[PDB]
Design an enzyme around this catalytic site. Structure first.
Site, PDB file in Angstrom:
ATOM      1  N   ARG A  46       0.878  -1.153   0.000  1.00 24.14           N
ATOM      2  CA  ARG A  46       0.000   0.000   0.000  1.00 24.14           C
ATOM      3  C   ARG A  46       0.920   1.209   0.000  1.00 24.14           C
ATOM      4  CG  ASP A 155      11.108   7.113  -4.449  1.00 22.73           C
ATOM      5  OD1 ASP A 155      11.536   7.554  -3.359  1.00 22.73           O
ATOM      6  OD2 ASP A 155      10.073   6.400  -4.548  1.00 22.73           O
TER       7      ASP A 155
HETATM    8  N1  WAP Z   1       7.017  -3.573  -9.774  1.00 25.21           N
HETATM    9  C1  WAP Z   1       7.163  -4.589  -9.270  1.00 25.21           C
HETATM   10  C2  WAP Z   1       7.331  -5.808  -8.552  1.00 25.21           C
HETATM   11  C3  WAP Z   1       7.776  -7.051  -9.023  1.00 25.21           C
HETATM   12  N2  WAP Z   1       7.810  -7.979  -8.081  1.00 25.21           N
HETATM   13  N3  WAP Z   1       7.376  -7.324  -6.956  1.00 25.21           N
HETATM   14  C4  WAP Z   1       7.196  -7.904  -5.725  1.00 25.21           C
HETATM   15  N4  WAP Z   1       7.354  -9.252  -5.585  1.00 25.21           N
HETATM   16  C5  WAP Z   1       6.778  -9.999  -4.456  1.00 25.21           C
HETATM   17  C6  WAP Z   1       7.643 -10.343  -3.302  1.00 25.21           C
HETATM   18  C7  WAP Z   1       7.198 -11.406  -4.238  1.00 25.21           C
HETATM   19  C8  WAP Z   1       6.693  -7.053  -4.773  1.00 25.21           C
HETATM   20  C9  WAP Z   1       6.401  -5.699  -5.063  1.00 25.21           C
HETATM   21  N5  WAP Z   1       5.889  -4.875  -4.069  1.00 25.21           N
HETATM   22  C10 WAP Z   1       5.514  -3.510  -4.037  1.00 25.21           C
HETATM   23  C11 WAP Z   1       4.993  -3.013  -2.850  1.00 25.21           C
HETATM   24  C12 WAP Z   1       4.626  -1.680  -2.762  1.00 25.21           C
HETATM   25  C13 WAP Z   1       4.771  -0.832  -3.847  1.00 25.21           C
HETATM   26  C14 WAP Z   1       5.289  -1.325  -5.038  1.00 25.21           C
HETATM   27  N6  WAP Z   1       5.322  -0.499  -6.206  1.00 25.21           N
HETATM   28  C15 WAP Z   1       5.329   0.862  -6.270  1.00 25.21           C
HETATM   29  N7  WAP Z   1       5.448   1.271  -7.505  1.00 25.21           N
HETATM   30  N8  WAP Z   1       5.521   0.134  -8.304  1.00 25.21           N
HETATM   31  C16 WAP Z   1       5.443  -0.897  -7.507  1.00 25.21           C
HETATM   32  C17 WAP Z   1       5.663  -2.663  -5.127  1.00 25.21           C
HETATM   33  N9  WAP Z   1       6.591  -5.176  -6.261  1.00 25.21           N
HETATM   34  C18 WAP Z   1       7.076  -5.996  -7.203  1.00 25.21           C
END
Ligand code: WAP
Length: 331
Positions: A46, A155
């Protein structure tokens, strides 16, 4: 009466030589995929402007990550999308796979390649000296690419680095703060996470460039080799500069401020004080020594400078002796 202008020392005119539509993202019309191809499995996060889910693409049983946006200005979405598209296929950049809208809720959703990210809590405390070098090199691949492509991330921080340690695979994610570099453009300083903000942000110098990313990268490195998260632990934006000043010293800070003829918010006069520049030994301890080497310290020194123009470039950084073992091994 007037801050002194800056240009980037590299990749300065890259966007000027491109066709308009490359960087003129308000022109961008969005290609919408079919939202019924994706079923959400579980929530992952989130963020500030989004809620993030794991999903399956049911056409190919592909695992995917879906970022459903909250209300943001259309041109910021056009910005995020345009940068992702420009950078698609570049080294260690996350791939945008699709874009969809809930037909009823009119909410846009970005769809990304899944990375099986082992958690940065416990990963970072098992990382060998070699591991850090390897992953620092892999981030620099991404940063040199996006910089050479006219983009600054703005960032860079641990949360926006996805690592699948089993497959030694890294992806730089979250491009929602990224912007195109244009010579003479004054950018928003209210960007990046507090602990990762460079001095230009903190002193309110708007004519910054790609070298902002290289400060953030220095912050990451410091915390990893000294095992101190976060390395510059400010109480707020003002005090963050003080934490920097307590290490880098006030002398170079005031030299930086003179050179660019910057007006310091009159508050800062109070709390900045006088502070010497400290040696890195004051941060080296028995539990971290196995990560700190002369070459690591030399490298860090050249990332963490107040003067953005005197920080290493991504390419320069990649040529540093800290990465000789890595470069040679990648044949
Ligand atoms: N992109 C991508 C990606 C690709 N994989 N991934 C994972 N993989 C999960 C742990 C298995 C988690 C995860 N988590 C996450 C959590 C909060 C914010 C964001 N975010 C913000 N802006 N773009 C993305 C991303 N993102 C990714």
């Amino acid at each position: 009466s007037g801050p002194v202008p800056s240009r980037a020392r590299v990749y300065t005119d890259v966007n000027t030589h491109r066709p308009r539509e490359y960087w003129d993202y308000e022109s961008h019309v969005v290609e919408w995929g079919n939202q019924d191809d994706y079923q959400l499995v579980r929530k992952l996060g989130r963020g500030k402007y989004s809620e993030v889910f794991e999903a399956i693409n049911i056409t190919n049983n592909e695992k995917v990550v879906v970022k459903i946006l909250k209300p943001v200005k259309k041109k910021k979405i056009k910005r995020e999308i345009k940068i992702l598209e420009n950078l698609r296929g570049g080294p260690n950049i996350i791939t945008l796979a699709d874009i969809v809208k809930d037909p009823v809720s009119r909410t846009p959703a970005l769809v990304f390649e899944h990375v099986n990210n082992t958690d940065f809590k416990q990963l970072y405390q098992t990382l060998t000296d070699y591991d850090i070098r390897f992953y620092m090199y892999e981030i620099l691949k991404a940063l040199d690419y996006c910089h050479s492509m006219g983009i600054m991330h703005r960032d860079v921080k641990p949360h926006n680095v996805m690592i699948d340690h089993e497959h030694r695979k890294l992806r730089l994610i979250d491009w929602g703060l990224a912007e195109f570099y244009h010579p003479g453009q004054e950018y928003n300083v209210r960007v990046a996470s507090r602990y990762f903000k460079g001095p230009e942000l903190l002193v309110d110098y708007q004519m910054y460039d790609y070298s902002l990313d290289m400060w953030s990268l220095g912050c990451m490195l410091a915390s990893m080799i000294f095992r101190k998260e976060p390395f510059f632990h400010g109480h707020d934006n003002y005090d963050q500069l003080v934490r920097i000043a307590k290490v880098l010293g006030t002398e170079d800070l005031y030299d930086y401020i003179d050179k660019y003829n910057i007006e310091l918010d009159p508050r800062f006069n109070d709390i900045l004080g006088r502070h010497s520049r400290k040696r890195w030994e004051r941060f080296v301890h028995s539990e971290n020594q196995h990560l700190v080497s002369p070459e690591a310290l030399d490298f860090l020194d050249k990332l963490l400078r107040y003067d953005h123009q005197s920080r290493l470039t991504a390419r320069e950084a990649m040529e540093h002796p800290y990465f000789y073992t890595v470069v040679k091994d990648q044949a």
